[PDB]
Design a protein around this nucleic acid. Structure first.
Ligand SMILES: [Mg+2]
Length: 876
RNA sequence: UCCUGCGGCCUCUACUCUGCAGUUGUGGAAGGUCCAGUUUUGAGGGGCUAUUACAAC
RNA sequence: UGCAGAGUAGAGGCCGCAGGA
């Protein structure tokens, strides 16, 4: 057999990249050896596989690791191992349905053997090699089988092209239609992977292109491109052709996979402040909205708009990567633990389902350090031992106990919910991440945060950090936290009085009202009876609203089933610490069951529907905690469908609540399932009991305006701030005064653009020819003045608006109340939307000032860079 | 002096797969919402509210 | 009816690297 001419003519390239291919392979094999604590087919990792089915496996955990990781690092091995199974079934007349270690070993033995051969030939001026002799063992056993394997591999690789790059039949036909002749392999095809290579025995070997393909399985995409570009393997397709790109992509599609910063965060911050906040974008004219839109080269619109407020996560990354806090660490989530409670759980619809329980893996540390701890080399979580399930593992509703517990793979992120930031205060510096311990493979032992801060406090914290330094900032948070702790310890000793409350160093406006009540001698619980009376009335009114709306409308059964499932559980009495009420899976089933319920007045189907509520122990004889009125819904007859069920449910609800109202009116005591007299809400608070809950059970709720006194003392010392009344100056105000007076800066120009609000339309009172209300775009000065005149202007608005209701025929004979109510709600909602929107945009301004300031500080102290000249006003 | 290819970061869109959607307790300094001769200075006042979290099923 | 995670793809911004004329 002759060396292919392509190989002989491009020897320096085949030489170079064959060596690179073999080194890359060894690298993977070496990595796997190290992580698992185990002539490349004699590598320890490959020996292991060779011997793995020599009797009963003594190291199954190692075998399985090797098989899994080999298929990760060598993606082509999934295809080739599958072909090797099918081959062996042929050879030994078997029906093995599953790939095993023998398949994997054989594929890689051959691939490595041929790669080694060509490596040796192409990296030597002259070596007469025995392995090229026609009919020899090497050719018959290794090389010729490999050529057929490679050819079958490529069939599948081209199929993968469709999935991966969206190529169509027409795109790939220049290869797919010409590979095989009529079925033979068309060795005359320009991209043929097999040839006779002047073998007198006339057996198919790897062609030059075939050898290039083998090599490229073991290269990075960068080197695939450098290598193939040197080779005349593209017939007449030119550098810019799609066909050339298809060929190259086909040679990389399943190839080897080889095993944030201060600067990056700074640049993430600057790219945040150039984007439009979403609340602002809504209010802008189409012209100004257009200013945030780009058309790309490929004629695609791309929108520079914030999808969420990333101020706080950006700030947390800034602190973490900067190593700016010695003691404080933020609350991170690192995935979920899933454990199998029961493989066969009978549900309230009488169908059996796997019952899997989840727990979040919450902890405290710097995002990078926590992330390094989360995923061990051996693919377990932290120091737990428990496996992290990978993307390749796809086993839905898996019922096998051996597969549990496992941990969902999720990158460490900060937990940022309910506008809060939770943190843990370490006594010592350079503490390790606080990962949760797992107990009995089932409980995730989490840690109550030290303290919790409003995300609305983060601007002032940032500002304090910028003026004083992160270490002084941190000492203040820690000192505030320790003041609250001293207070709560004194409460537990009953040593807090009106006479000494000031000594604790906490302003009245930052003490819980219950402490203030307790020292003033005015401690009281809420009035449960008042609450019952009010709740019953509110709910009766709502029930009638829903009855009317439904008759009028006659509709999403999904929407109906949401209402019904919530309400059914609301009215279910609790016993035994709430252990009797409907649990998550059964709740999902009940709600879905309702949404799709539609007997054809089929008796069995009706019985089945009723039975569900019997099994949930809501209706039926012998039930101890029944729903108070649901059983009336099924008295006389079962409703035929979800819509009938909703109607009957609401009527029965109305009768129940009317009864309650009537008993309340007689001065009698009533009880509802979901109001519980034994809850602390209803009792008088005690100093000592409340002391302990505040110290031990909850995070410290950090006060607003923690940093104000220190911020204001600093700024008072600056001469540029001389003419500021610090007695009417909040931190939002002072950030902007700092930017203007000390830095000669201002906010981004797009915060001066005119905005639209329905409420301001109503207050402006301007109509078109047809009589519709106009969408104005106002300045802030205009809105200031409309708002001053809102009483008069609201009067005008209502007068006109009411007339326009009675002009329309549907609401023509409408009561004074009906109209007045419709308008009341219209103006309230609009006014509230406008006020909140304007407040939030004013926060976005000063948040952007702070990101800009911090980013600029990072980059100033980096690089061959100077940036004293740069200003937020220039950002667009 | 630019074009082709590769890696990292962040965002958006499409697709697949896998999962979740409940209870009780505690907690209204904080968060949400509503009222006003309140704020364009998440500043302040009054009312209503378990929403983050943690524990247990 | 809604939410979450991972993978892949595509489009885009910024940074870094390689190669050919
Ligand atoms: Mg305050």
């Amino acid at each position: 057999m002759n060396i292919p001419a392509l190989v002989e003519n491009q020897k320096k390239y085949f030489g170079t990249y064959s060596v690179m291919a073999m080194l890359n392979a060894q690298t993977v094999l070496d990595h796997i050896q190290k992580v698992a604590d185990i002539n490349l087919w004699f590598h320890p990792v490959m020996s292991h596989l060779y011997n793995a089915k020599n009797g009963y496996d003594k190291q199954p955990e190692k075998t399985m690791f090797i098989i899994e990781r080999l298929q990760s690092y060598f993606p082509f091995l999934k295809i080739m191992a599958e072909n090797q199974r099918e081959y062996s079934n042929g050879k030994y007349k078997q029906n093995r349905v599953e790939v095993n270690s023998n398949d994997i070993f054989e594929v890689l033995k051959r691939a490595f053997g041929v790669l080694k051969m060509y490596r040796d030939l192409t990296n030597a001026y002259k070596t007469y090699e025995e392995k090229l002799n026609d009919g020899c063992e090497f050719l018959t056993s290794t090389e010729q089988p490999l050529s057929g394997m490679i050819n079958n591999y490529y069939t599948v690789a081209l199929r993968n092209m469709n999935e991966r790059y969206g190529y169509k039949t027409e795109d790939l036909a220049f290869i797919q239609d010409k590979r095989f002749k009529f079925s033979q392999v068309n060795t005359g095809f320009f991209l043929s992977l097999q040839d006779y290579n002047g073998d007198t025995q006339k057996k198919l070997h790897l062609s030059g292109v075939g050898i290039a393909l083998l090599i490229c399985l073991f290269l990075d995409k960068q080197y695939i491109n450098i290598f193939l570009s040197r080779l005349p393997i593209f017939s007449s397709y030119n550098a810019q052709s799609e066909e050339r790109r298809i060929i190259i992509r086909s040679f990389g599609i399943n190839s080897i996979k080889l095993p944030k910063s201060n600067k990056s965060v700074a640049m993430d911050m600057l790219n945040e402040v150039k984007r439009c906040p979403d609340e602002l974008f809504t209010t802008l004219s189409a012209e100004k909205q257009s200013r945030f839109r780009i058309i790309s080269d490929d004629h695609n619109e791309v929108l520079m708009k914030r999808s969420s407020d990333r101020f706080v996560p950006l700030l947390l990354q800034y602190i973490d990567y900067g190593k700016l806090f010695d003691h404080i660490r933020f609350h991170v989530n690192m995935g979920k633990l899933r454990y199998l409670l029961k493989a066969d759980k009978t549900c309230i619809d009488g169908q059996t389902r796997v019952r899997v329980i989840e727990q979040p893996l919450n902890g405290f540390g710097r995002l990078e350090e926590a992330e390094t701890m989360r995923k061990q080399e051996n693919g377990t979580f932290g120091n737990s031992g428990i496996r992290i399930r990978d993307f390749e593992n796809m086993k839905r509703d898996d019922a096998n106990p051996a597969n549990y517990p496992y941990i969902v793979d999720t990158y460490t992120h900060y937990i940022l919910e309910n506008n809060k930031v939770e943190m843990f205060i370490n006594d010592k510096e350079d503490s390790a991440p606080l990962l949760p311990v797992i107990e009995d493979d089932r409980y995730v032992v989490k840690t109550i945060p030290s303290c919790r801060m409003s995300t609305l406090e983060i601007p002032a914290m940032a500002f304090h950090m910028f003026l004083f330094g992160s270490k002084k900032t941190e000492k203040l948070i820690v000192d505030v936290h320790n003041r609250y702790k001293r207070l709560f310890q004194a409460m537990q000793k009953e040593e807090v009085t009106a006479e000494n409350i000031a000594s604790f160093g906490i302003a009245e406006s930052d003490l819980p009202q219950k402490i203030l009540d307790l020292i003033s001698g005015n401690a009281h619980g809420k009035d449960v009876d008042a609450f019952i009376r009010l709740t019953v009335d509110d709910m009766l009114t709502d029930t009638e609203r829903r009855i009317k709306r439904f008759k009028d409308d006659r509709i999403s059964t999904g929407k109906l089933a949401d209402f019904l499932a919530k309400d059914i559980v609301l009215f279910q009495p609790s016993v035994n610490d709430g252990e009797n009420k409907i649990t998550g899976l059964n709740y999902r089933i009940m709600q879905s069951a309702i949404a799709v319920y539609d007997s054809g007045d089929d008796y069995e189907a009706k019985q089945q529907f009723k039975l569900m509520f019997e099994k949930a122990r809501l209706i039926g004889k012998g039930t101890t905690e029944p729903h108070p009125f649901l059983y009336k819904v099924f008295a006389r007859s079962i409703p035929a469908n979800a819509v009938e069920f909703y109607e009957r449910y609401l009527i029965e609800r109305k009768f129940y609540l009317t009864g309650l109202s009537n008993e309340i009116k007689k001065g009698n005591r009533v009880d509802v399932p979901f109001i519980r007299r034994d809850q602390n809400k209803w009792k008088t608070p005690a100093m000592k009991t409340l002391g302990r809950i505040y110290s031990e059970d909850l995070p410290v709720e950090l006060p607003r305006q923690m940093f104000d006194n220190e911020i204001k003392s600093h700024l008072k010392s600056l001469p540029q701030m001389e003419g500021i009344d610090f007695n009417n100056a909040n931190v939002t105000y002072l950030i902007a005064e700092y930017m203007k007076r000390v830095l000669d800066d201002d906010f981004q120009t797009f915060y001066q653009w005119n905005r639209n609000y329905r409420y301001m339309d109503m207050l402006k009172g301007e109509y078109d020819r047809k009589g519709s209300l106009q969408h104005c775009f106002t300045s802030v000065e205009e809105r200031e003045g409309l708002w001053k005149e809102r009483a008069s202007r609201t009067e005008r608005y209502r007068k006109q608006a009411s007339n326009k209701i009675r002009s329309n025929r549907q609401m023509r004979n409408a009561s004074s109340e009906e109209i007045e109510t419709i308008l009341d709600k219209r103006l309230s909602n609009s006014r509230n939307e406008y006020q909140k929107s304007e407040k939030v945009i004013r926060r976005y301004r000063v948040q952007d000032a702070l990101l800009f300031l911090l980013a600029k500080k990072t980059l100033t102290e980096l690089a061959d860079f100077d940036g004293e000249r740069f200003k937020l006003k220039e950002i667009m």
